[PDB]
Ligand binder design. Structure first.
Ligand SMILES: O=C(O)c1nccn1C1CCC1
Ligand SMILES: [Zn+2]
Ligand SMILES: [Zn+2]
Ligand SMILES: [Zn+2]
Length: 231
């Protein structure tokens, strides 16, 4: 089964193989008095690995690299952070020191610098307008518009029909909004509609935090965001 928040100690990282050459990575972090799970993605790219998002902190991200070496044994050569918050760029310095080329959109890099978060080194061009898509090796990167943050990207793995929604997509067990301080609530449903229209074939949808599902996670997130909008 998919590992849940209460069975991962803070500091440990679990890997979940979704398909040949596609994994999620799952870590936990304590925030504001609670413990949260957090997901990212690993995609095999020939003899190398592409990493999507850190494991939420330098300590977790070091453990992430250790678990990848243990369970996969291929080198992580590039990493993409899907927005500027610490569950996505926290650990970029660890990755850079290990020889990983770290990437984010110019928007994410700008917002990380303002916030004082770690800044991925390389820039992802071609993603500044809502609906923009670019290929990045074995994945497609998609900017759906502002949602959880103004810079959030989603990631699609065509070989496996895996859609990583990042923090713009909520797991089912989350029925209230949570951290929307940086969100565009007015645009978030429209941005989710763009995801649906661009990846209607997705079979395996991974939220930023918690259990994967199908495309029903998009409807779920829209429902939850609209309820927050109305209260
Ligand atoms: O909503 C998120 O994407 C997130 N990431 C880290 C922490 N959070 C919030 C705060 C309650 C869940
Ligand atoms: Zn965030
Ligand atoms: Zn998050
Ligand atoms: Zn729901």
């Amino acid at each position: 089964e998919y590992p849940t928040v209460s069975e991962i100690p803070v500091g440990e990282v679990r890997l979940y193989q979704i398909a040949d050459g596609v994994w999620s990575h799952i870590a936990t972090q304590s925030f504001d008095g609670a413990v949260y799970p957090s997901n990212g993605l690993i995609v095999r790219d020939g003899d190398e690995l592409l990493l999507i998002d850190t494991a939420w902190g330098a300590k977790n991200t070091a453990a992430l690299l250790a678990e990848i070496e243990k369970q996969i044994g291929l080198p992580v050569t590039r990493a993409v952070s899907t927005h500027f918050h610490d569950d996505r760029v926290g650990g970029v310095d660890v990755l850079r020191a290990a020889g990983v080329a770290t990437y984010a959109s110019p928007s994410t890099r700008r917002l990380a610098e303002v916030e004082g978060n770690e800044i991925p080194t390389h820039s992802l061009e071609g993603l500044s307008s809502s609906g923009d898509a670019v290929r990045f090796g074995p994945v497609e990167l998609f900017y759906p518009g502002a949602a959880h943050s103004t810079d959030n990207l989603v990631v699609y793995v065509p070989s496996a029909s895996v859609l990583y929604g990042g923090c713009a997509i909520y797991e089912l067990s989350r029925t209230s909004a949570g951290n929307v301080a940086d969100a565009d609530l007015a645009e978030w449903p429209t941005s989710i509609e763009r995801i649906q229209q661009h990846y209607p074939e997705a079979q395996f949808v991974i939220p930023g935090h918690g259990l994967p599902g199908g495309l029903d996670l998009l409807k779920h997130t829209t429902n939850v965001v609209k309820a927050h909008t109305n209260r």
